[model samples]
Target: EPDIAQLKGLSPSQRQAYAVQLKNRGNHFFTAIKYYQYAIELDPNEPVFYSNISACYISTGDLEKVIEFTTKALEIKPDHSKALLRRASANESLGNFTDAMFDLSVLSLNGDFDGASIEPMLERNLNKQAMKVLNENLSKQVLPSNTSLASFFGIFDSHLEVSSVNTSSNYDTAYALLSDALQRLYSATDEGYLVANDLLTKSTDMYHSLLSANTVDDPLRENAALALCYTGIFHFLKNNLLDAQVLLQESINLHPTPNSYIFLALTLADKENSQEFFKFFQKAVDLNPEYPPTYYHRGQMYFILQDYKNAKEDFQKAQSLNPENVYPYIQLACLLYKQGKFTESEAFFNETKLKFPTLPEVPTFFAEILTDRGDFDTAIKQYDIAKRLEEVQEKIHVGIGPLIGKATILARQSEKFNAAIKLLTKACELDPRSEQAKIGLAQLKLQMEKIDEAIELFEDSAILARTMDEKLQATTFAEAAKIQKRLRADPIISAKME
Candidate 1:
């Protein structure tokens, strides 16, 4: 507010005092910045003058400049609270919550707030802190053991703040963020159905961009392991397991990333080499002892071997690790059902339905539970929902389950053979190598007096029947009493009958 020409003839102390007078005046902020700059020139070593300039910059909304000047001020005087508050706010503005929170904590520990409106600023910084934690967790691809989601975000889901990943970061981190997003997106599974194309495009684009980014002439950069890891995950999402294994194995042989090992294990889940899958999972667990996914996937391994105790322990650790991820909850719920804990299973299944309603995996598992309970009608409806959700994406298990499930119910209820056959036919087409589907189809055909074709399918079923010996044994008793009893069983299947 004071005239600069009037100050030109004054002593340095007098001009410095006058600059303070103008800075404290509060309205002519640009003039205040000029005066503050003049004061800094008058006394170059005065940290207060640099901070005053930062204050003016804050008022002008030049947050980048505010940080710059305040950083200099703090460098001059490390504990300068005035400069710290300015720098902290600027860091917050630039989405650096960790730095802001650290500064805020320092101020609180020093018993200094300068009578500023700090309470609301701290309260509003919840978003910043939540995002900071979420991204940190994502960067490591591990969830911590003891942070409730509501506690982390204050009042919202973690995804709302954590979704804006820094794709422009290094290729490794960019790939991690992209994979984390894809994992979350699939967990928002039915939502994937609604926008899978968009999600696919985004994932593909990011992977290609990362690949190109590494193609530049940096010895430290070409052929990134994390990029291949995410590209594998992209293929996994698209139901291309062969491509997923190819990429994931390439990633592993080159770098041996924990994520790559875990994903490689998943790619081998349905294959004959069962021990190989666990060995892959064990490598991941050993390499990344703190990662939630390693434990989560290892739980799957134990579950398959009927090792319920170990499976439950692993899943509990996974649940304790990830407050936001619902995989452990779903897995535990299914395990509880396996253990005959129906009420607890139902509670968890219901919680998953309410919390992650769009997840097709939840509904599909729920339908399996219903089928086991003999509630065929309700089960059919649930399976249909799961089936519709998976059909477009070709979710192999979910796609095949409902069709076979409905057929089983139809045959169990002594309903029309034709209707059951129609369902199993589609199931067979979808899973051409399914011995379960072939056995069902063959039994039905034999009952309908299709002798030649039915006998041919029986031989195919026997050869294809890797497991489920009971299904083939059921063929020994598979025959009709007479022609009026729908289609009578052919001679091949009736060989053991009286």
Candidate 2:
């Protein structure tokens, strides 16, 4: 805390000592190094001055200077705890883990601080303190020969192990369970609920064991963190929001990864908590600038808020980072489609299809865009593809996809009467609660001179409608206008029939 003026009156060595204190308090290391070196020049034999200067050099990311200064400090004071710890971190950063661990052991044994305190502090800081110390020390140290190659291979091996675990055959089973759970939840049928509950229970147990096994080795903390993230995602899918939040927060606390933030953000967003969700998403991108999904989700939020330019920029960034991610392309296509750039939207949809050939949602999305643009043939083709994919998947109720496609195609082509009736019959057989299908079918029935059938269908649909809008629309009074018109024309149709 000494002022510059106070240091000005002191000797150069005193000023350098003061600078080291500032550096330790998180001041810029380059400036600290200059001051420390000036003091070293004035008092070359002061061990603490050399040690402190070396620490500053480490902070400045100059490893060569760290080695020189550390050696000089040890020459004068062989058992300096701070110097040892700093050197150890540098060695660790330089992939000299053995040497680093040796130094750490030495500090652990000799230093007054107990392992309990150090361990808790490490956990609380999430290894950030260790990372910072390593950066400062290694910056000053001169790396040993072949260190770069050794470090590269070491990292490669670590990444390989992680990749194997995350994408292993066992992990594939977990993903299958996850998909099954989602399908069951969406189906909302008795069998669907039973399947969902079973899958969720199994996945939760498996993930618990996986997390425990991975966290046993401290070096693989990131793996444990990722497992927590997946656990949270599973919990979210199961509608256990509190459990999801707890797990996700733990993952973030362990390591601020983008995926954790994205999942957490999505959960909060679903609850309409946009402010908190945006903050989490913003932090995610700030931590990992190249994380495409973070930008993609943020783009969606911006679109919701009607901030088109910002949404476009985020979507563009996401596309740039990962062109194969179909969501961003679809979003961009939607934006372009809204702006009346039909050809451009078509091009974007084509790009999406090429990138993610197996994306079931892409064809539906493309079909909607084409239908909006009046390209009936292309729209029908896309719809056909989507319907085929849905049928192959077999999770969908029978005839649902075909009926929807037929309704859309017929409506757009102005051949609504027969097509609407056919679609309604098929849809009602598949899903009794399809108010839209029933309405269409009833209106079409009246047009085809099936007045009694049309009245009964409309009345049944109205009685079964879940929403107020559906109830109002499906009522006798609401359909009276069409019904009356059909009744007036009924005699003419009856005479023609006879």
Candidate 3:
């Protein structure tokens, strides 16, 4: 109820003193805000008046107003800690996490806030921003590259067998197609995968028809189950989890086999049903103690869970069961690294490299360990060797892992961001269905402010994602790009952006 003319006549200090009095008693923030505004008008150059107004707005839950007033305060006093903290908190609440992160970083450098207090806040902001970016850029391609296919199937034995084949022409047809699919997959070329896909599809169809016919012959039923088992595995490889589950379950119903049980367990693991997956793994082991994959795959699950003791035992068992396969050796080396036995891990890796001198997988996986250890130079060298080895292969051996890893490392260097982009671009072209390549390229495009291209890449990634979470992530990235593009279209906002 005070007269405007009388308030205008008051000195800035007097107005601020009254504002602080109002703010102290009964938390009269709105009234305090008016006095602070009057003080700001009386002494237009005073940053404290603007910051006090921002503090009032903070209590009133007018976050945008808090930002506006704090920004004014920052303009007058660039290093104003209170203004920066208030602005950062407001930005964080408004989902402008990057803006919040910038302010927090500046505050940290100012050393006004203790590291212990500020570090968690900074870490949270970074994690949230990264998660947002990742979610926005997610999608899936149904089938993995031949390189991935080979790696996946390599865990299983390749002794293609049917218990017996005889009079049933329908079983004969199904068996022929199924066996042909396995043969093509083992051919070790791009054309092998293409043909294997076709053969598997036909085999699945034949098996479905054979099973539906409901024949009385037990031999025909058993052969049909075998075909279904392989078809289920094929479905799993293609990311059709429901189909894989159904076919695998049906296979068990007709005639239980160790391979079917193992693949079904894998399918369950993908579904994240850990309890059921373990039960299936146990069944597979009981059904055939000699099958190496049961131990190897179960070991992988244990590795993921960080049950290192159990994982080591399983890996050793798998290695003893199949001495030719390199995965157990690689896994043991990786486990050593995870356990922080750096010298021993390096020695083991070196030994494995000697054992499989020409294999790209050895170098590629070792590079991951090197990167995790922060040895960028050695990691880059390892990845280079892997990439060169893969490039020389008739079949796509390591897919895009080397390119992606090297590009990731290179992108950390300001001068090499463009070089990283080039490598990722090649990776995208090589495996169009690769979500990793698409998302990586999209992130780089976003950094360059190529909003439209980033949006397109994100959308494609969403399309290729198999899981709903991945799709949502990809779509989120696309939407975020669209928002950015809209902001860029506005000259005021665009001009203000760094």
Candidate 4:
């Protein structure tokens, strides 16, 4: 019911521009949508006006309409940020997290609206699926991986597809009962409902309910190792490392899988008895000699012990054992870099580039090597490649690593102050604790002689800094600025401090 004549001679862009300017106090959303509709009619193929309308709908809690308009906007322009958020949020909140993830994934390709913000739910969903698989296998009398249930029957009879009628895999049955519970658990974990620990405990108890309710043929030790292992892994994932240690140890005493030992070792590392964990680490290796994972942890132990030479060797060994595994290669490249073997590190990264062409991390590390060698231009190019590859995370919305790297390079490579500040600001927004981003911002602030702001930023970064040297660096610069301030307290007093 808008004035149709207003659109008669207007170009789509002009119509959009005018619509953007038209807002009122009364029925603002309703009024704005009409204007936005006018703009869309002028050029139905245009996406912005659709986004505008979608935003109006969103404000009114007209999510159905938001889904309608944003879908059209995206069909016209795939990378439309405004519409993407509207549609993704509408779906995400409506018990449609998977569908929401589809649109968010595409938006994550660029930093426009930074689709990465929704990744927490996506990661939680993935972990839920992984946990389901593990739980299913744990309750199996005969695992898909060919393992058997240890000695005794599990406490519960949970399952999905009636596991083969092959042995009343009642524990798979018990685990199956918990899927409904897991759906809620994953949702809470995604939202970080303050009851994360409590929910995990409740779910573990649900798994244990079968045992507590049991009045069956009890074995010599009353073992339900599969259930114990899965619950141990559950606690392990939530960082209830103490509970994880106890549960996984029980699993090992009954079932004795290499993985149980590996997890036990990892959980033990967080306890006061870290050194005692090493014996289990070697036991896992002996149980599964070809398992590169055993070597992976052994490398971590060596790395922390400052046995860099051994750590490097262990990583290389893991890589040789599992050529397709991406992680060991990254560790090896990093270890070589730490060893001051620049040439070797570069070679490893280059090999990784060829071997793992799809991995953004390969180029990111390659760029760091270039950065260390003072080749900022090449480093910036690789960083851009990493950015384009859609490396994403949940919070702060941007991948701070390459984003800050490119910003730092641009600030140094060219005297592009404003451009650097724009990226650095986002870098800080994503991680306020990042000393590097604040350091760069403060350094740029010095150019504008915003000494007071720079001093505050320097002080903040000092506290956030991870190392002793970085704290000293923050102190040195802060004092430098203070001395400069004192020197300039008055033109003449400034000279006396010098």
Question: TM-score for every candidate vs. truth?
Answer: 0.43, 0.43, 0.70, 0.45
**CA RMSD (A), model 1:** 31.4
What overall lDDT, based on C-alpha atoms, would model 3 receive against the true structure?
A: 0.78
How do these models rank on lDDT, best leading?
3, 1, 4, 2
Global fold similarity of model 2 (TM-score): 0.43
Error at 86, model 4, angstroms: 62
Provide the overall lDDT of each model, using Cα atoms, as 2-decimal numbers: 0.62, 0.61, 0.78, 0.61
Clashes in candidate 2: how many? 14
Per-residue alpha-carbon lDDT of candidate 1 for residues 250-337, written as tens digits (9 for 90 to 100): 6775567677887777766764457888788788888868777778878877888888999999999888877566678878999999
Which prediction has more favorable lDDT, 1 or 3? 3
**In candidate 4, which residue pairs get closer than 3 Å at backbone N, Cα or C atoms, i.e. clash?**
157-170, 157-173, 157-174, 158-172, 158-173, 158-174, 159-172, 159-173, 487-494
| Top candidate by lDDT | 3
Q: Which residue runs does candidate 4 get wrong by more than 4 Å?
A: 1-168, 172-202, 215-260, 267-274, 304-309, 391-399, 408-417, 425-498
Better candidate number, 3 or 4, judged by TM-score: 3
Please report how far candidate 4 places residue 291 from its true position, in Å. Answer: 2.5
lDDT of 2 by residue, 1-498 (tens): 335565567877676666556545433444466555655544566677777777677757987667678778877876687787677667656655444544454455444857664444223232333344334533571111121112111111223223423333332334455545544544534355455556655655655565555333432345446656756765665456788899888878766788789889876674345688778988998888987777887887888877789889999998888765456777898888777788887798888888877655678777877776777788778877876775565333222544665575775466455666676687666555555566667766766666677767776665555434545556642344332444345464334334
